[PDB]
Structures are given as structure tokens and as C-alpha cells.
Amino acid sequence: QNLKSTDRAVQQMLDKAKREGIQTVWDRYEAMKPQCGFGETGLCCRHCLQGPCGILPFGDEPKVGICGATAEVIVARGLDRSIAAGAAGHSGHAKHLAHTLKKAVQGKAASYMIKDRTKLHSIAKRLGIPTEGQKDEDIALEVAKAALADFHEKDTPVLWVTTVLPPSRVKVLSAHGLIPAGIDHEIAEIMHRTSMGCDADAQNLLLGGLRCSLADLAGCYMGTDLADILFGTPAPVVTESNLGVLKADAVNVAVHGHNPVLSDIIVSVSKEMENEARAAGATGINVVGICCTGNEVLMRHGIPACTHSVSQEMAMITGALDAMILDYQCIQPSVATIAECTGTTVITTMEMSKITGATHVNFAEEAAVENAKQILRLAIDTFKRRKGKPVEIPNIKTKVVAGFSTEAIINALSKLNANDPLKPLIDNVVNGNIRGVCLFAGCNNVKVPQDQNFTTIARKLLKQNVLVVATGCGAGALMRHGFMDPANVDELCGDGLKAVLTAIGEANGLGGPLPPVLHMGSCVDNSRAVALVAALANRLGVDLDRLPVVASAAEAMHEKAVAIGTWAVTIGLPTHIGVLPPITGSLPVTQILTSSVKDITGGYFIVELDPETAADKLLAAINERRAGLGLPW
Amino acid sequence: QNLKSTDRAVQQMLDKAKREGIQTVWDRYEAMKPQCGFGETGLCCRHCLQGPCGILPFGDEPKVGICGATAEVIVARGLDRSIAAGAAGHSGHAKHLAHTLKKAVQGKAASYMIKDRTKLHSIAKRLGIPTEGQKDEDIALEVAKAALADFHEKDTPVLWVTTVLPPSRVKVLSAHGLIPAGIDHEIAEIMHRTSMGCDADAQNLLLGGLRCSLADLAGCYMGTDLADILFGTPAPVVTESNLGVLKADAVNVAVHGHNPVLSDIIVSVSKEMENEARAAGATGINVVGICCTGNEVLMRHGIPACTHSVSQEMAMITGALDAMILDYQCIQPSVATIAECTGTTVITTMEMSKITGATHVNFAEEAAVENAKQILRLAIDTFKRRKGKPVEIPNIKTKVVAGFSTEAIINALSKLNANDPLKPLIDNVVNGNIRGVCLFAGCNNVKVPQDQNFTTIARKLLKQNVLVVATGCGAGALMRHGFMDPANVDELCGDGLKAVLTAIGEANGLGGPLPPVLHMGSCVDNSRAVALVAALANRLGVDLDRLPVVASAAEAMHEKAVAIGTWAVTIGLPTHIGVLPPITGSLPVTQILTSSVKDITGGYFIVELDPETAADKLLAAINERRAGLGLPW
Numbered sequence A, B: 001q002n003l004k005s006t007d008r009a010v011q012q013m014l015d016k017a018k019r020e021g022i023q024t025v026w027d028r029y030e031a032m033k034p035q036c037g038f039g040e041t042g043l044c045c046r047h048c049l050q051g052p053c054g055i056l057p058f059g060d061e062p063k064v065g066i067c068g069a070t071a072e073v074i075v076a077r078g079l080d081r082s083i084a085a086g087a088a089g090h091s092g093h094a095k096h097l098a099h100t101l102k103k104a105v106q107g108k109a110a111s112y113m114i115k116d117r118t119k120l121h122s123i124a125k126r127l128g129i130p131t132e133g134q135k136d137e138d139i140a141l142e143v144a145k146a147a148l149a150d151f152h153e154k155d156t157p158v159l160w161v162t163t164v165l166p167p168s169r170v171k172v173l174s175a176h177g178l179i180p181a182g183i184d185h186e187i188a189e190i191m192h193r194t195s196m197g198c199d200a201d202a203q204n205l206l207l208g209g210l211r212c213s214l215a216d217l218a219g220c221y222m223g224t225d226l227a228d229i230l231f232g233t234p235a236p237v238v239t240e241s242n243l244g245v246l247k248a249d250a251v252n253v254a255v256h257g258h259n260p261v262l263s264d265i266i267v268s269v270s271k272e273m274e275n276e277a278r279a280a281g282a283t284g285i286n287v288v289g290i291c292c293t294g295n296e297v298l299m300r301h302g303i304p305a306c307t308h309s310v311s312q313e314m315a316m317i318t319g320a321l322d323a324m325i326l327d328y329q330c331i332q333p334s335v336a337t338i339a340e341c342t343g344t345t346v347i348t349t350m351e352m353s354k355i356t357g358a359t360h361v362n363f364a365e366e367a368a369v370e371n372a373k374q375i376l377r378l379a380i381d382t383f384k385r386r387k388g389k390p391v392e393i394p395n396i397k398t399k400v401v402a403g404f405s406t407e408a409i410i411n412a413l414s415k416l417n418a419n420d421p422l423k424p425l426i427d428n429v430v431n432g433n434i435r436g437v438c439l440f441a442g443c444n445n446v447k448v449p450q451d452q453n454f455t456t457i458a459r460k461l462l463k464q465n466v467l468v469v470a471t472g473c474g475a476g477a478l479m480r481h482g483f484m485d486p487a488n489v490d491e492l493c494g495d496g497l498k499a500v501l502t503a504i505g506e507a508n509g510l511g512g513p514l515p516p517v518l519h520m521g522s523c524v525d526n527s528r529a530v531a532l533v534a535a536l537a538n539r540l541g542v543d544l545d546r547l548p549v550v551a552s553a554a555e556a557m558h559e560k561a562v563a564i565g566t567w568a569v570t571i572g573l574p575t576h577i578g579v580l581p582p583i584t585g586s587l588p589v590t591q592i593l594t595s596s597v598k599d600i601t602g603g604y605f606i607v608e609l610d611p612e613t614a615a616d617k618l619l620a621a622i623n624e625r626r627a628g629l630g631l632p633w
């Protein structure tokens, strides 16, 4: 089981699944091997009914697609389509929040409201929207109108790109025609250009991909901003993670997926439904989190995290999960089958995201609280059905400190310098206490033993004094292995990083250091690390491609992660990916994405499947940036 | 060579290619076999880095994707993505025309103008735009603003759907939530819902696909309307087709691709550049057409058609093609390689559609005429370089009567009944002279011997008195085998159809019948047959799914053809596809698309690879509609 996951509770549940004959993601992976080399390398195209076209990586024919598409064209077109799909996911998340805010301030969804008015004012000022003498409701109405308008062509380019990156960075990208014209415009234009008999030049295609990745960034940043306006900006919180956060004696309700719009309401309504759950004979309603929706309610409300990503099925294997409430993205459709063996009620709520065999509750913001009650009532019923059943929850959980938004980080730092809060952090970079900054992002991938790359690379970087922040299921992997527990700072962090974490935490009324890794939220909250990095850039006078900041999608799975890696490259970062992406069938494209892109954006991909090597390479990139600033290392 | 193409000039040029060692689409196809069964059946998914996932059509494992995606989910998601790519192509075509019209009437692109003011007024009235007391330039400005606005969410659904279908049809589609909210909105939402861990219900996914296909329809209809405003509505014209339209003694310039925006300017400017071409020693500039751009200038200006689709390379094999001017869509990137053997200058003109090895001319509407001169000058130079070279143009050409827009058809019919022009046509349906109507649409596919399905099915339907109309490369296939030559009416058409064609043509000052097949334009001008069918629906009081109208993508290749077949099904038509689409790996999805979709839209797919069988099935569907109206058959 140790080749499947490094998580001990996941191993316990894999044993139970094998005992009980429940098929798992790892079993389906085992039945899939050997996987196809054409697809694995990118050398396969189906954008034509003349296809499929396979191109051998090496040897004799076939050497070219039927229409004459070369290997680099096929590879570049495939990658471009996956960037557009990732952009479309983060896009739809943010679009739906934009509609929710619009509905809220127009009196149509009373379950929603402006919870963060300082943020609303910040965003409106950054966008050039006038605040002075305006009603909050009208400022928010303008901010939502701008959000929706960034999806199409207009007078201006995408404001959630051009107003969130330092002007020098915007000038670099715009001299290469990389500034998106509208989010959905870019997605559709990718789909156009990559269809048969269109763009057939790898450089041209990859430039389009960089532009589309920035559309994805805009969607992430939009979603973050709007969820913060709607639901509050995260501040540091203490909670727990892993399967042991489940309780045999409560109604256990997992919120799963990505959009917090419904699950924040679920969190707030379950509090009221406590008394009714307890009339059914439960101790209460125990809302836990899975994947990014879970991270949203962990960041804002301290909801404990049950599990993430490749291991989501294992929550159900305990027999104590009574409801799994989905919205969309990264939900294994297998849950709906597995529920028939475990008694969990799987509930979808989004019209475009349904799974055959799952109960559907048609969620509308205009009836949010009503929907919530209905859904939790189903959960309560399911708990009744397992009154006295034996459950096996592994008694494994870690302590998690999280809620480190960029605003929270800046406030924490301001306790060391109120008038120039980024300065303490910059000072410790300059004197070597902080070697650089590494963002861990992305998901788990069944091909990599779960969390192994995240934890190995993290361990090496922390010993070398790299400040580590994390999002999405990368945050999830690090939190389930103790990396967000301050009590591990001694074992994990080199002396200088230890000193800075201790200084900031003791200055923040915690009596202890900050945790070894700063949890910055969901996959859309990858934009938060942009806002931090951008701010450092601005405070220092230099473009992003000169900062000792790096990013690692250590176990990337989802098309969203490919779009995110591509916009970490486009805004200027060295960007490790720890899973093989479908680029190795073409040397020209690999060369562009790992080398010559440096001469356009300053970022570049680092493709490295071995995590010790990947950590060396990330440390080398950080130290190259240090030397470029004239710093020691 | 006869198993490759049924076109005699294509066979001559295949012989020359084999002689001279030039690789062709058919050779690359031969090197591709045996093709992959997973892709061919749809049972393959790469929307995850955990992939590729192959699912055996039959047998043991693998039976499910790694994430638990079933076979019908994988198949439905693949098909949905190809509908969105087709929609994105027709979408971008129409978007670019919308921007061109906007630029024209704002004084920014003087090479463009309102050429059809009657059409502009029609469109503005159909859209609810006010015409009375308005400047043309301001009406057109409103019409372009509405065009651009149909790409995103707004007060209203997509007007190029809801104002072009009969209200009963709009009510049917809207009771199923199939009315698109914005063209690019639908494309992005498909990309969202089909990415990993989202929609996992085949019915839900296929309903999304129908909605996206209607976005594609909107894009087609928009593109038609705007090109008609900008460039004139086609009226009947006489021209020629096939390779013999090339002339050894002229500068031979092929316009190739889909957007007429540049090639109409090329047509008009080459007239002036005649004298300069003839100073180089040519007889003149001979502009010929390939694929849909060619069909646009054939429809409007009588430009002769050289070739289409699977056989486009053969134009270059003559050695007499001096320039091939591309915009985008269905251009085999092989042209750019083959040009090095044939001396043709391949010129791309669109920023998102470049081919490695081709000269790029950056075309801007604001400098259209200038760009044209530059491009034709390159053509002229290339002609000089082959002064005295031997060329082999096959002396094979057919006579083509074309330009049968819906307006042209209605005018022609109005010579038999001025006050009720659809009535003569309806009368002859009712008395059996016209059995029904069949639209041939789509491309050629290297798997089908070129034009064989189009010509076989056409022959059978014409003998049974079916009125046949055609677009795109289906129009191309029928025109190159004589089906748009009135002199073949006797050999081709049954007695009643012959009588109606003779009556209309002799009433239209032609002294002969109309041609056996009505050429209605490009792939976007598939919308023209909608406008005709809709009008018949409205004139008769019945929904489209009650008319004896059918559609056949007899040799479909491009993702655009899949979107077109899907919106011919969604607006209510029996819709034959003559190439295997990637649906056979899932019986549920095949059942939905060929049977149970009848109970939603009234249309259905007819998948039939044998053309004699396909013609039987199309005749049976037409006669089923006849019986449903209570007619004889």
C-alpha cells in the first residue's frame, strides 16, 4: 500500500477497500497499464475524423499526421487545448461568483452579501472604479460588471491581468502580444487555432498558449477576489486534517469540489441544523472538506480537511461518510458507484456537473439556504440508516495552521515593521535567512505515490531556508504530513528560516513560530501568491523574473494545473512540474518550454520526475536569481 | 488511383506526385494504418495527466478510466469538445467579420463598406434594431454590436439563434434548456464540463453538446449575414470548376480557407494588377478558389473553383500554381512542405493561423488593398520564375451554375408566384414532383474515396425527385462531377424534379432548367438552408421536425462538420453522417444520438457508411415525414 500513498490513513483505507472488494483509483490505474506511448508523449491527434493520428517518438512511419501536421504541431495543439480547458474551469468558477455577487447586491439572493468591504474597496480602486460617495452595493455592482466584462472583447484588455501584474511585467507580455483580450475569447480562439487546418507553427501556437494561460490567471484572481468580497478574506486559523477528523457519532458531511458558493452556505446552515441532527441521534453535523471547496472553508471557517485528490474515495471507505456534496472539478465519478457499497449519499448540485447514480439537488443562490436544509436533511437521514453500524475511521490527524492570505501575511509582517511590512521579509532574503520562496500548487497524480514528491521536495527546500507556501491539493499533501504544524518547525526548518518564522509568530501573539509552510488557499488562490510576488516586485523595483521565487506542480494531474504552470512561466517564474506532461514527443516544443521561453517571459518549465533532483534544480534556480540580484548564496 | 479519388484530374495529379516522389494526404494515410481502435470508437481520454485512458470496446480490462469515467462519459466528453471546437471556428470567422463591419462604418477600413443595404435592413429588423430615420452606417454599427454581443451573456439569449428559428422551434429547444447564452460562453462551458472531475452523465453532457451546436449555428448564420452585408448577397452565376480552370499562361492565384474578408479584396485588386502581371509576361491574374473561401468568391463573383478538401495539394502538383493565399481552417499544413517541390508561394495572412515554412503577410483590414498588392506582387514574381517551365494542368473542368442564396431561390420562385413565392415549391412537394429536400454539407475524408459518397447518394436522391442543395466541400464534390450543370438535368433528375427545375429556370430567363443541385455557398452558408427551411416551416404552420427535409455530411472530416451535424439534429432534421464518428464505443450514446434524441428535438443522426444504404435511409426518412404530413409517397 506504501507504493500507492504515503498517507497512513489512506493506507488503512486501501486495506479496507481490498478486503471488501471495492475498486479504487489505484486498481483502475493498475488495470490501465501499460499506458499508450503516443498519448503519454503527446504524439497523438484526434482533431479530425481522418484520425486518430499516432506519430512514433522514434523510428519509421508514421512520422506525420494525415493532414501533414508535424510532431511539434500536434504536441503544441494538444497542450494548447489543455490550457484552454484549465482556463475554462477557473473561468467558470469565477463567472459563477460574479453572477452571485451581482444577484446579491441587486436584492435577488439574500443568503449572500458583501462580507468584506475593505477588499471590495481595494478591488474597485485597483480597477479604477470610483468608490467615494458610492453605496457599497453600487461599487460591488460595478465590480461584478467588470468581472463579467473581462470574459469578452471590449475597450480594454483583461483587467484581471493588467491591473494585478507590475507595469513592467505588463509591458513585457504586451510587447509579445500575450495580454488576453477576454477570457472566453481566448479559450474559443485556442479551440479555433488548434482545430484541423489552422495554426501549424509551434512557436505561434505556444505563444497563443501563454496568452490563454494568462486568461486562466485572470479567472483565478477574479474567483479569489469575488469569494473574498462575498465570504471574507481568510485570516490565520487552527484546524485539523486527515481522516481522523471524521467522527463516528456525528452526521459527517464532506464538501467537495471547487466553488465555495454553496458550501459556505452549507457551513453556516449546518450550525442551525445541529439541533435537528441531534434529534436524529447524532452529536451534531460534522462538516469536513475535500479538495479545493474544502480548502475554501478551511481557510475562512477552520473546517477540518478529511482528504484530497487521488485519495477522495478513501473518505467513503470508512463507512462513516453520510453525505458528499459536490459542485464541480476533480470529483472522481467513481464516488457515485462506490457510494452503493458504503451508504454515503452522493449529491451533485450544479447543472453542468452531474454523475449518473447521484442524487441531484438543483442549487440556486436565490434559494441557497432552502437547498442547504434539504441537502443536510438527506445527510441526517443517511446517518439514521447507519445507527449502530461499525465504522473504521483511522485515528490519524494532523494539526493545521492555515488562513495565510496575502493580506494576512502582510499584516503578520507588519507587526515587525508597520510602515513597510514587506521589508522584514526582504531583509531576511537579503541576509540569507530566507533563501527564496517556493509555491507548491496542484494535485496528486495516481502515477506518483501520493504526497511523495510534495513532501520530499518540501523537506529539502525547508532545510535550505526556502520560504514555502502552498495551495490546493499541494497544500493538502503538506498539511496531511504535518507541514502546517508549528511544532515541527524545529525538525523541518533550517536555522535562518526557523528564526524568521519564530520572529513573526512571536510578534503575532502566538508564542510560537509560524508553521513550516504557509497555506494560501485553493487552486484559484494561487493568485494570492501572485499578489504577494507582484507586491515584492513592486517594492523592489524589479520584474518578477528577477525575484528568487519558484513554483512546483510536484504531482500535477488536472488540465487546470497545466494552465497554472503555464502562467507561472508566463509571469516569469522557474516552474517545476513533477509529472510527465505530454510534450516529450517533440524536442522543439520541449526546448521552447524549458529554455527559449526564458528569452520571452523570463520563466521556464523544469520537467523533473525525481523529487531529489527536482529540489536540486529548484534550489539552483533560486540561487541563480539570488546571484542575478548580486546576493550571496 | 481510383480507390483514392473519383476525380479524374485528381487521379492525373496523383500519378504526377507518385512519379515525382511528392508525398500526398493519401500516402500519409497509408503510413498511418492500422489506425487506433480506441480513438476510432471514442474510447480514449487524455483530459488528465493520469491518462491516456483506453477502454476496450469489448473484453476484459481496462473497462473504466482511471478516475472512474465510464465509456459513455468518455465518448460524450470527446464529442462535446469537438462540437465546441467546430463552434469556435465558425465563431471566430463570424467575429472577425463583425469587427470588419464595425471598422468599416467607423471610417477605419475604407476597403470595406455596406455593399448590401437591403440585407442590412432585413437583419436589423429581424434583430429589433430600429431602421426608420437611421443612417445606414449607424444601423450597421448596431448590427455589428449585436453580433459581438451574442458571444457573451447578456439580457437576451443568442439572437442569431432565437430570431432565425420559428418560435415553435425556439419553444421546443428552450423547454430543454438548449438555447445558448453566448457563443464563447457555451464553448468555454463545454471545456469546463468535459474536463476531469466535472460532468459525468452522458445525457447531461449530450444536452450540453446540442446547446453548443446551436452556438455554432449562430456563428454560421452571423458569418453569412455579415459577409452578405459587407460583400453582397450571392445571385446565380455561371463559372467553371476543377483543375482545368488553371491556365499555364496567367498568374494563377488560389484563395484558400474560409474567411472571405481578404480574398474578396484579392479578387477586386487583381483586376487592377492585371496590367502589371502582363508586364511580367502573363496574360493576367487568374484567381481561382479552394475550399470555402473559394466558394465565397465563386458565389459572389463567379471565381472558378480549382479543387477542394482532401485534394487541395493536387493544385500545386500541376506546377502552375504560383500563389496559395491562406487565412484559416482546412488548410493541409503539408502545402508548405510541398511548395518547396512545386515552386508555389504559400502565403498565410492571419496571425493565429501560421504554417512553418510559409511566407507571412500580416493582413489588416485597415490596409487591405495595400496587403493585396504586396501579396499579388509575390505571385507575379513566382510566375516570372517559371517562365518557360513545363506544367501539367489536367484539361478537365465542369460547368457550374451557383449563387443560389435563399434570397436568390425565393426570387427565382417568385417568377412563378410573385405574392407567395414559397407556394410553387410547396405545391410540388405536395403533388410529389419534389419528394423532399436534402442538404449535402461537409468535407471529403481520406478514408472515403473522394466524392464517392456525395455522388452516389446524390444520384439516387435525384432519381427519386428529391430537391438537392449543397454547401462547402459537398457543393465542391457535386460541382466537380457535373451536378451543377443544367445540361445534366435529363440524365440526373427524375421526371417531376426535372419538371420543377425546368419550370423555374424557363420562368427565369435561362431557356433551360436550374442545375440538378442548388449550390448555396460555404460551410457557414449552411445557415442559408436553415433560413429556407425555417421559411417553409413558417409558411406551413409546422415545426422543422415535420418537414421532409434531411441533411447528409456524406464524407465528414472536420470538427466543424460534427458541430453542423449536431445542430441539424437539434433544429429537427434527420441527419446522415457517412464517416464513422467517435461514438461507437458506447451504445448508450449511440442510442441517444440516433434514437432518443428524436423525443427531444425531432431530429436524429443516421450513421451509415455504405452510400447506397445511406440513400435508402435518407429516402425512408423523407417519406416518413411525408406520411406524417398525410402526403403520398
Ligand code: SF4
Binding pocket: A045, A046, A047, A048, A049, A050, A051, A052, A053, A065, A066, A067, A068, A069, A074, A195, A196, A197
Ligand atoms: S487534424 Fe491532422 S493530425 Fe489531427 S487527426 Fe486530423 S489528419 Fe490527423
Ligand code: SF4
Binding pocket: B045, B046, B047, B048, B049, B050, B051, B052, B053, B065, B066, B067, B068, B069, B074, B195, B196, B197
Ligand atoms: S479524466 Fe479520467 S479518463 Fe480522462 S485521462 Fe484523466 S483519469 Fe483517465
Ligand code: FES
Binding pocket: A036, A037, A038, A039, A040, A044, A045, A052, A053, A054, B036, B039, B044, B046, B052
Ligand atoms: S493512439 Fe493512444 S493517445 Fe491516441
Ligand code: FES
Binding pocket: A036, A039, A044, A046, A052, B036, B037, B038, B039, B040, B044, B045, B052, B053, B054
Ligand atoms: S489510445 Fe489511441 S486514441 Fe488514445
Ligand SMILES: [Fe+3]
Binding pocket: A291, A292, A308, A309, A330, A443, A473
Ligand atoms: Fe483536488
Ligand SMILES: [Fe+3]
Binding pocket: B291, B292, B308, B309, B330, B443, B473
Ligand atoms: Fe474544405
